Amino acid sequence: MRLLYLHADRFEYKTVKPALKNPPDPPGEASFGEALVVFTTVEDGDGPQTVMYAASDIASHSSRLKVTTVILYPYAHLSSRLAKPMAAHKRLIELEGALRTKFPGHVHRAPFGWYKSFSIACKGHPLAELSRSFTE
Amino acid sequence: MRLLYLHADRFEYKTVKPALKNPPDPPGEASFGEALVVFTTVEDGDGPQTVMYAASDIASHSSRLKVTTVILYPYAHLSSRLAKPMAAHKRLIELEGALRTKFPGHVHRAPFGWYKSFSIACKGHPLAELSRSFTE
Ligand SMILES: C[C@@H](O)[C@H](N)C(=O)N[C@H]1[C@@H](O)[C@H](n2cnc3c(N)ncnc32)O[C@@H]1CO
Ligand SMILES: C[C@@H](O)[C@H](N)C(=O)N[C@H]1[C@@H](O)[C@H](n2cnc3c(N)ncnc32)O[C@@H]1CO
């Protein structure tokens, strides 16, 4: 699993065309104020262990940033070893679920399988953009 | 070399704290309308061949998008095999130079070695976000 952590003043997205034949989540749009935006790429081999490490890391990073909103934003582009779409969707659902058992704020998982427009205002402090790898 | 291509309606950045002991480019800020924003991570081993492939690809992608502005935005987070900062800065300078010999529009290379805030409005069409790897 490969993640990009973006500490944002605001974030918004909107689904547009389907990027998969039958996207497993419905279309939609949402916008947020200050949030940790987590671009999430599921890699071949990612399992329950990986999900658990990622969830713990997101929770502790969110806590140090003092954010109360986390966006789990599915992203195809952070790896050249992608999990298949069925497995990836499963892992992202598991990730959202696991995060709620460790983090008390708003957790929003963006729809999987869509092209999306997005806008972000990313903060410029030293911890505002980080990347993480998790494996098992 | 690893690149992320973001077709944006607008982009802006501002340097904040230094991310390196002595950043080799001066601090600054800039903002743009519609542009191809290229997040650029230089990898260990990237040489003139890599620069040339990347430059050609950016030029042809920019042409299909019909954009007339390209932002070369140094980014540490797209690889786990980073080039050292001296080599990386050199390669990004070479990349900007090479791009101008292939692309007729505005080429803006953001300062290397700084933490930056940024804001982007990324388009949602199927070709709006792509990743590329170049090697030699
Ligand atoms: C394109 C851009 O605007 C959008 N943001 C996009 O990247 N969409 C991806 C993910 O939503 C999802 N997807 C498929 N496989 C994976 C995977 N292994 N990991 C994460 N997501 C995946 O399926 C889409 C196309 O494969
Ligand atoms: C942090 C964030 O806001 C900002 N955008 C940042 O990521 N800054 C990076 C790049 O500007 C540059 N840098 C160093 N090595 C490399 C490399 N191999 N490739 C590209 N850039 C590099 O040096 C900074 C810290 O290493």
From Swiss-Prot, chains A, B:
Alphabetized GO MF terms: aminoacyl-tRNA deacylase activity; ATP binding; threonine-tRNA ligase activity; tRNA binding; zinc ion binding
Subcellular location(s) of the protein: Cytoplasm
Gene Ontology CC terms, in alphabetical order: cytoplasm
Effect of mutating H77A: Isolated domain has decreased deacylation of mischarged L-seryl-tRNA(Thr), no activity on L-threonyl-tRNA(Thr). Deacylates correctly charged glycyl-tRNA(Gly)
GO annotation, biological process: threonyl-tRNA aminoacylation
Keywords: Cytoplasm, Protein biosynthesis, RNA-binding, tRNA-binding
Membrane in keyword set: no
rRNA-binding listed as a keyword: no
The organism's place on the tree of life at top rank: Archaea
Assembly notes: Probably interacts with its catalytic subunit.
Family: Belongs to the class-II aminoacyl-tRNA synthetase family. Archaea-specific ThrRS editing domain subfamily.
Protein's job: Freestanding tRNA editing subunit of threonine--tRNA ligase, the catalytic subunit is probably AC Q9YDW0. Deacylates (edits) mischarged L-seryl-tRNA(Thr) in trans; has no activity on correctly charged L-threonyl-tRNA(Thr). Probably does not aminoacylate tRNA(Thr). Deacylates correctly charged glycyl-tRNA(Gly), but not glycyl-tRNA(Gly)(2'-dA76) (the terminal 2'-OH of tRNA adenine 76 has been dehydroxylated) nor the 2'-fluoro tRNA derivative, strongly suggesting the editing function is catalyzed by the 2'-OH of A76 of tRNA(Thr).
Domain description: The N-terminal domain (about residues 1-140) is an archaea-specific tRNA-editing domain that has a highly similar structure to Dtd (D-aminoacyl-tRNA deacylase). Editing of incorrectly charged L-seryl-tRNA(Thr) by this domain is tRNA catalyzed.
Stated name of the protein: Threonine--tRNA ligase editing subunit
Organism: Aeropyrum pernix (strain ATCC 700893 / DSM 11879 / JCM 9820 / NBRC 100138 / K1)
